[PDB]
Amino acid sequence: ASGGIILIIAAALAMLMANMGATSGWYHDFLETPVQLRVGALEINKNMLLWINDALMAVFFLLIGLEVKRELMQGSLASLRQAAFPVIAAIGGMIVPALLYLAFNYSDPVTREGWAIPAATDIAFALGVLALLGSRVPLALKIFLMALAIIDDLGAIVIIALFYTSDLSIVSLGVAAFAIAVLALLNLCGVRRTGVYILVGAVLWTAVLKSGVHATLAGVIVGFFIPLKEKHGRSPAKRLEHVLHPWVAYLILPLFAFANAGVSLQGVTIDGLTSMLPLGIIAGLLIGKPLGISLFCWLALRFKLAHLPQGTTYQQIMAVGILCGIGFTMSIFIASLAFGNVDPELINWAKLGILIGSLLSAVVGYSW
């Protein structure tokens, strides 16, 4: 559970940096620093936070691409029947948190763009809370929760990168398509040097630099093509996932939390927190997650299209539904995509709703 504590400390310092007279200012101005890259005629203008997030979420989603692949062929999602329960819980864990959010935000066209914010679940945080009491919690839950949180996060990133994301340039797609093809020919020819895939993946990542959500999905694509075969008792993907895990839990996620979870608290009142944007997120996380998860799981069980993990009791299914209300880093990233190039206070009110919702979901889910 070590990864979860170091993440909260990182968020604690950020709130501290953002709310002290001496630090707040240098903290805000650093993150808002403009970074202009100019390559001949090409020109990429992103502030500092954008450049950092695009790199951090790249490697983070590279690890998820490996974990999706290992669970899709060797774990929970391997068969179509075992994957019935995590998938059903995920759709409910997405539509109900979004419906609640939309119920509050439908009348404002500017805020109803962030409907996917309370659909994300911080895997590292939620696993930390489970591992905090994980002396003898059922093994199936920790893999169920992992598979559950991943499909929503990836699906959200997918649907954000299909519709709501802006189109790329013609040249950028040609290189992206060619880079993916080289990753395919590398896999079909059976090369097992992990660094070569990372090399081709770097070209992929660079071509779509202007789109932060595409540079993110570039990580998932690379993680899919790292070979998983076990020749001579060695696997490139299993080895790479083993290398990335401590770096993601102890550096990538803490840095992402430190650079994004700091909002000023000055002037924040209960009436402000009950406006449509933060409360829609709070209600989406604190209520929408355990509602949609329990409802669909209960609907699954009764209507024969179901399964059940070993040692489940079905009260522990709705329990982790509450723990899935911890959006945290993943919801913050979604909010940064939904609320870029709009009014700067939209992202600030969003983080406040996420932090309150996630903190309530963590404490409430800890009582069970």
Ligand X SMILES: CCCCCCCCCCCCCCCCCC(=O)OC[C@H](COP(=O)([O-])OCC(O)COP(=O)([O-])OC[C@@H](COC(=O)CCCCCCCCCCCCCCCCC)OC(=O)CCCCCCCCCCCCCCCCC)OC(=O)CCCCCCCCCCCCCCCCC
Ligand Y SMILES: CCCCCCCCCCCCCCCCCC(=O)OC[C@H](COP(=O)(O)O)OC(=O)CCCCCCCCCCCCCCCCC
Is residue 193 at the binding interface for ligand Y, with CB under 6 A as the rule?
yes
Cα 253 to Cα 330: distance, rounded to the nearest angstrom: 10
**Min separation Cβ 93 and ligand Y, Å:** 31
Question: Out of 73, 191, 265, 299, which residue is the one contacting ligand Y (CB under 6 A)?
Answer: 191
Which listed residue (46, 70, 112, 192) binds ligand Y by CB under 6 A? Answer: 192
Distance CA 143, CA 150 (A): 11
Supply the minimum distance, in Å, between the C-beta of residue 117 and its own copies: 30
Residue 30 in the binding site for ligand Y (CB under 6 A)? no
Q: Is 196 in the site for ligand Y (CB under 6 A)?
A: yes
Query: Residue 173 interacts with ligand X (CB under 6 A)?
Result: no
Least distance between ligand Y and beta carbon 135 (Å): 23
The C-alpha atoms of residue 31 and residue 48 are separated, in whole angstroms, by: 5
The answer to whether residue 178 forms part of the interface with ligand Y (CB under 6 A) is no
Q: How far is the CB of 247 from ligand X (least distance, A)?
A: 4
If contact means CB under 5 to 8 A according to the sort of partner, which of ligand X, its own copies, ligand Y, none does residue 80 touch? none
**Binding to its own copies (CB under 8 A): which residues in 17-76?**
33-40, 48
Q: Does 195 bind ligand X (CB under 6 A)?
A: yes
Residue 93 near residue 299, CB atoms below 8 Å? no
Among 72, 173, 198, 356, which residue interacts with ligand X (rule: CB under 6 A)? 198
- Binding partner of residue 191 among ligand X, its own copies, ligand Y, none, CB cut-off 5 to 8 Å per kind: ligand Y
**Residues in 241-280 that interact with ligand X by CB under 6 A:** 243, 247, 251
Pick from 2, 130, 127: which is nearest to 67 by CA? 127
192 binds, among ligand Y, its own copies, ligand X, none (CB under 5 to 8 A by kind): ligand Y
81 interacts with ligand X by CB under 6 A: no
Name residues contacting ligand X, limited to 222-241 (CB under 6 A).
239-240
> Does the protein bind its own copies through residue 189 (CB under 8 A)?
no
Residue 250 makes contact with ligand Y by CB under 6 A: yes
If the CB atoms of residues 195 and 272 are measured against its own copies, the closer one turns out to be 195
247 binds ligand Y (CB under 6 A): yes
Those residues with Cβ within 8 angstroms of residue 214's Cβ, 6 or more apart along the chain or in another chain: 161, 165, 168, 176, 208
Interface residues toward ligand X, by CB under 6 A: 59, 193-195, 198-199, 202, 239-240, 243, 247, 251
| Residues lying near ligand Y in the complex (CB under 6 A) | 182, 191-193, 196, 246-247, 250-251
Q: Summarize as ranges the residues that interact with its own copies (CB under 8 A).
A: 33-40, 48, 195, 247
